[PDB]
Design a protein around this nucleic acid. Structure first.
Lengths: 337, 103, 185, 201
RNA sequence: UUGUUUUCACUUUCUCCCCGCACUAAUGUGGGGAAAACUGGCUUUAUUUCUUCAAUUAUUUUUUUUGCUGAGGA
RNA sequence: UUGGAUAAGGUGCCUAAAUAUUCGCUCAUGAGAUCCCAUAAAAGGUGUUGGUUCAUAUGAACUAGCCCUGAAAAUGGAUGGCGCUAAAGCGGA
RNA sequence: CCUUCGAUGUCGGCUCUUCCUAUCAUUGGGACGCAGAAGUCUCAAAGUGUCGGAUUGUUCACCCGCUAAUAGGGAACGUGA
RNA sequence: UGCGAAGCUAAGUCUGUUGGAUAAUGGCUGAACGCCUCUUAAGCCAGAAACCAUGCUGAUUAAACAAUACUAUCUUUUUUGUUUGCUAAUGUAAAAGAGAAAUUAUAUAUGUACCGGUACAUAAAUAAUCCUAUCACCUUUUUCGUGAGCUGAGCUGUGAGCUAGGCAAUAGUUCUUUAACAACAAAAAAGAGCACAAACUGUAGACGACUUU
């Protein structure tokens, strides 16, 4: 028979299976779309756990009770150890999906990036990327011509540089960042100048726009239903313990449905956070970047006492709405809206 | 060039069966260019050779043939029933058979 | 039920026609005519010095023996309409608020306001190459026109159904956008 | 039936009739490659077949939809599943017959220039009254979530252009081969000439 | 509580004419009439291989290509 | 046991045999599809066709085949499945 | 009284999941004896949600309130290793 | 008693999208039936928390796959064969000419030339078609094309021929016509690094696994 008292189900079925993520980085399923009218620019960035803090503001929404009066807010200030652009990937559309035509590597590749291709770098011969970077420019011109002729999606292989961070890890994190714009014949020039250097943010990251964050949540190992799904605790009188789901299914179907909360892994999940509007542009070295003309004191992105379980931050800063998932030292991926 | 043919192609369908009941004495065979009972009747006395290959030699040769002949037509779409000296193994269903021009 | 069903059209003297693959190509005065009728089984007999179109259905059983009647009056009205523009007679209607019209962009993207005082944005379109525009005689009248029957007709059809209100009794709340009569240039 | 493999153009073909013919061929042992499966026609209104596919979609194992009926929205996979439903895929011979079939949308690389055959027993123009309603498998798949219909069309038009150019070359080659036949004939001896004429060569 | 007979109305056409005079689906048509009857049927003549001599039933005589079977041992 | 030929039932594929021939009917935004058998009614029907009846090529009233409404239940779902509409449906031959 | 008496754990509540629609609210509509409100009849629709307590073992019930609504049911009268 | 870094933790803070066809309704035309008439006639549009996408989570859910980086003595032709548990070695779901590239419309399409239109051709049992097969050998007279080496072009080889010549098959009546493809073994000729473990880490954790040095 029906339940006496209805209540919404415990947890969301849209985040199943609640298993450990296969990787540590935050992978992007989907990049922002492109349009014919729009002009060609960049698409995404990356970094590490930077800080999600307050900043004092003032509403201007017509009809609020705060408006002119001061408000306090919440947003994030982001980290950019300059990513290094080392590769280009071309993808073309097929009925079986979007498929790689080819990837072209830069003439000179760093050692942090090379270290990612190894499990024991200290004991290896460091032979990766040793005879594939001395190819003639003729093959480059013979296949980049095919890239524009056949491919519809262009991505740039970029890698972080953890040596600029207090991380123990020495391998670089590698990802690919799309490129967006309008018509193909306007991309050939624009994809021919920034193919080796590192990444300064201010080219595209601009005030009054929205971006999203993607990362891996903290790990908590195996946890019960009461913590994994937040089910109701059983009364103290329960015989074989109270931290469980009482009925895990009706008699029929004669099986346990996949919608029943069970014990298992919680945390170390893959998540994306939406609707974070970017607000401000800044740098790493400059001194008048974070404070304003109303306060005119002396201080910047710099922290105090040392960042607990992280270290000291010595790279760039910006401003963006929200707060961020994952633990300290975790790689965070920053996509646009 | 070489290897003259002088035989007609056929494919071994299943046995002479009903739904969920088989009679392995007769095997159904479809002939290359016959599609009517009247044309299938043209091949009655003709011998049928099922020539298959084995994994190892048996008389210094890797090829074994079993013999039969077409006894009658089956249906009205140019399918014949053939009777062989030994029953066709069901692993041979869909395999190629030779409707020889003799007698 | 019988075998040959057809009508001998009388081609207007002010047009000149031709046929290919149930795609009739005609020329009148305002322009040229074609249309896709490949949903129906249709054959054509045609003359030009002696003229008259014949659209013929073979073995037409009565359920689809009315496809012919439709097109036989329709195309016969088509050339007449493209010669002499078909003019319906629509009145913009209002009981309280005389209608506000912001006709931007040369008969294209027509606007409607001052209809129950919502003071918001509303716009229903029409066919390209067909005019539904204010008659200078009376402000409460927008004369329609065009060359095709459907051209002059959907442009009077899509409009009655565009700015309808809510929670009012039409038996006493007589709001609408009326279409009454048909005339010609 | 007696070829190495048969390539079938599925354009303008009724789904069930085509599937039955293909299934019988596969069971008899003929390998079939079905191309342009997105142009398969189905009798009945597009909304009717849409309702049928939604009825199929709402069908899943309640305990674990992972084990439930996979829905396979690509039109080639739809034709493949329809064919599988018409052969005993639970048996070894039926599984072999099922694996002897290849289904594609459009014409991939090794099917640009092999002959595409047509089964007239399943053509819409011969199997459906003209006044009756039919749908298109590509459109139905796009309505139920295939979303690759436009790309297949744009690849198909490039294929059409390539085939147009190469057929235009082939007809010139053929008519040159015909006009060399004319004076290859009258230079041949009369006794062979007469045989060739009277036997239509 | 019937037989019997009598009365008219029918058919071939690329016949033709007239009216609508091209209105035909056509190398014609909607209507009114004249034509012979090249249609046809009827009675004959010698022939049925120039060409039909069918179909059904009853009563008979064969024939093409072929599947399977060989008990027995007087 | 070996051949032949059939009964019931079938001949689109599953599945051996007709995508047979021949004549009609039907489009269903929950069509229909073999005795037992696996539900369906009252009530509504100017589509088809033969109708039947009466009124001066002219209107209705009935009548009956197919189709539709009436027709709502719980795990996901079953003309046996796929599917089938110039039927592979319904009624004949 | 068809199955089970060499045993299918027989009420209710708690907990938890899913399903149905004969829809309580929410969405978009048609009608009204519809000026507006507030409502009543009805259509497509099961995506989302349907509560806190006093008495009683109770289901049922009945009150006090909140709510937007506090709709009706099934799942071996769902659920006692 | 106290905070109680950080951890863990809510009773706090952060965050929680737009696109397609879509029911009733209203219409265009307009029959049946002179004319009216949403269609119990035919053809065309307006339009919902539902649907499917988008987005998000898995993807040993596809026993799935791609690109890349480095490496493994390795790779191409010929002959003979595959008739201590091992150290030569063979398997076919289908060779017998397994021959065949326009696209499309079905109440006609396809080409060519002009500016969807025009004109002219082609096609309509369309695979009921077309294409490919046997002329062995050697000798001689030579002819026309393709490759090695050589400087649009000379020579050799190759493929197809022309003239003329003389030269072979035989196993007793058939038991598959041993004829295909792929692989392997031996012998010849030619060319051609990483991971686990260990210690550390703790962004991880029941153990594996995972993140690191």
């Amino acid at each position: 028979s029906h339940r006496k008292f209805e209540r919404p189900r415990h947890g969301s079925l849209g985040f199943l299976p609640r298993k450990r993520c296969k990787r540590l980085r935050g992978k992007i399923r989907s990049f922002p779309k492109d349009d014919k009218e729009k002009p060609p620019h960049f698409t995404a960035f990356m970094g590490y756990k930077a800080g999600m803090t307050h900043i004092v503001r003032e509403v201007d929404k017509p009809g609020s009770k705060l408006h002119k009066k001061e408000i306090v807010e919440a947003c994030t200030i982001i980290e950019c150890a300059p990513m290094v652009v080392v590769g280009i990937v071309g993808y073309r559309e097929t009925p079986k999906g979007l498929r790689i035509l080819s990837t072209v590597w830069a003439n000179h590749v760093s050692d942090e990036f090379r270290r990612r291709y190894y499990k024991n770098w200290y004991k290896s011969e460091k032979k990766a990327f040793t005879k594939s970077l001395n190819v003639p420019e003729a093959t480059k011109n013979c296949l980049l011509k095919r890239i524009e002729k056949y491919c519809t999606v262009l991505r740039a292989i970029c890698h972080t540089q953890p040596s600029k961070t207090p991380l123990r890890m020495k391998k670089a994190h590698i990802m690919e960042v799309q490129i967006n714009g309008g018509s193909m014949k306007e991309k050939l020039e624009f994809v021919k100048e920034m193919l080796e250097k590192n990444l300064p943010v201010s080219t595209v990251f601009n005030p009054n726009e929205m971006i999203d964050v993607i990362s891996v949540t903290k790990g908590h190992g195996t946890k019960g239903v009461v913590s994994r799904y937040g089910v109701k605790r059983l009364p103290r009188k329960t015989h074989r313990g109270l931290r469980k789901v009482a009925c895990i299914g009706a008699w029929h179907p004669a099986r346990v449905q996949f919608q029943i909360p069970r014990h298992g892994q919680k945390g170390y999940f893959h998540r994306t956070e939406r609707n974070k509007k970017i607000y401000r542009i800044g740098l790493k070295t400059d001194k008048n970047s974070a404070s304003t003309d109303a306060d005119i004191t002396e201080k910047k992105i710099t922290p105090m006492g040392g960042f607990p379980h992280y270290g000291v931050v010595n790279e760039d800063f910006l401003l963006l709405k929200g707060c961020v998932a994952g633990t300290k030292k975790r790689p965070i991926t920053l996509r646009k809206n | 060039l070489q290897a003259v043919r002088l035989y007609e192609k056929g494919v071994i369908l299943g046995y002479k069966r009903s739904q969920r009941n088989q009679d392995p004495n007769f095997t159904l065979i479809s002939i290359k260019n016959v599609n009517t009972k009247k044309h299938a009747q043209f091949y009655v006395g003709k011998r049928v050779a099922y020539v298959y290959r084995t994994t190892k030699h048996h008389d210094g040769v890797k090829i074994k043939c079993i013999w039969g002949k077409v006894c009658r037509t089956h249906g009205n779409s140019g399918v014949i029933r053939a009777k062989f000296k030994t029953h066709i193994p069901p692993k041979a269903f869909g395999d190629r058979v030779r409707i020889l021009m003799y007698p | 039920k019988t075998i040959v069903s057809t009508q001998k059209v009388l081609i207007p003297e002010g047009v000149k026609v031709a046929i290919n693959a149930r795609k009739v190509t005609v020329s009148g005065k305002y322009g040229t005519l074609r249309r896709s009728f490949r949903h129906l089984p249709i054959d054509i007999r045609l003359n030009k010095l002696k003229k008259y179109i014949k659209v013929v259905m073979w073995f037409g059983v009565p359920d689809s023996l009315a496809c012919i009647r439709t097109v036989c009056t329709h195309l016969k009205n088509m050339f007449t309409g493209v010669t002499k523009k078909f003019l319906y007679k629509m009145r913009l209607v209002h009981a309280h608020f005389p209608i506000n019209s912001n006709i931007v962009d040369n008969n294209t993207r027509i606007e409607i306001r001052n209809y129950l005082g919502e003071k918001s944005v509303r716009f229903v379109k029409a066919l390209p190459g067909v005019v539904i525009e204010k008659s200078p005689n009376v402000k409460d009248e927008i004369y329609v026109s065009g060359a095709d029957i459907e051209n002059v007709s959907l442009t009077a059809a899509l409009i009655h159904q565009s700015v309808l209100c809510r929670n009012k009794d039409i038996r006493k709340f007589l709001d609408g956008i009326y279409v009454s009569e048909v005339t010609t240039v | 039936m007696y070829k190495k493999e048969y390539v079938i153009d599925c354009k303008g073909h009724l789904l069930g009739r085509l599937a039955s013919l293909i299934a019988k061929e596969l069971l008899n042992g003929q390998r079939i490659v079905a191309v342009r499966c997105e142009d398969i026609n189905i009798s009945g209104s597009l909304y009717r077949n849409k309702l049928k596919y939604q009825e199929f979609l709402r069908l899943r194992t309640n305990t674990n939809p992972k084990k439930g009926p996979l829905h396979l929205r690509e039109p080639s996979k739809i034709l493949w599943r329809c064919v599988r439903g018409m052969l005993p895929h639970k048996t070894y011979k039926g599984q072999l017959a099922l694996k002897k079939l290849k289904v594609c949308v459009g014409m991939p690389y090794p099917y640009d220039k092999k002959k595409k055959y047509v089964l007239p027993s399943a053509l819409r123009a011969f199997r459906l009254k003209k006044h009756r309603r039919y749908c298109r498998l590509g459109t139905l798949s796009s309505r139920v979530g295939w979303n690759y219909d436009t790309l297949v069309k744009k690849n198909e038009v490039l294929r059409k252009q390539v085939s147009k150019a190469y057929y235009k070359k082939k007809v010139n080659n053929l008519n040159e081969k015909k006009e060399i036949k004319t004076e290859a004939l009258n230079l041949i001896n009369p006794e062979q000439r007469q045989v060739l004429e009277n036997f239509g060569y």
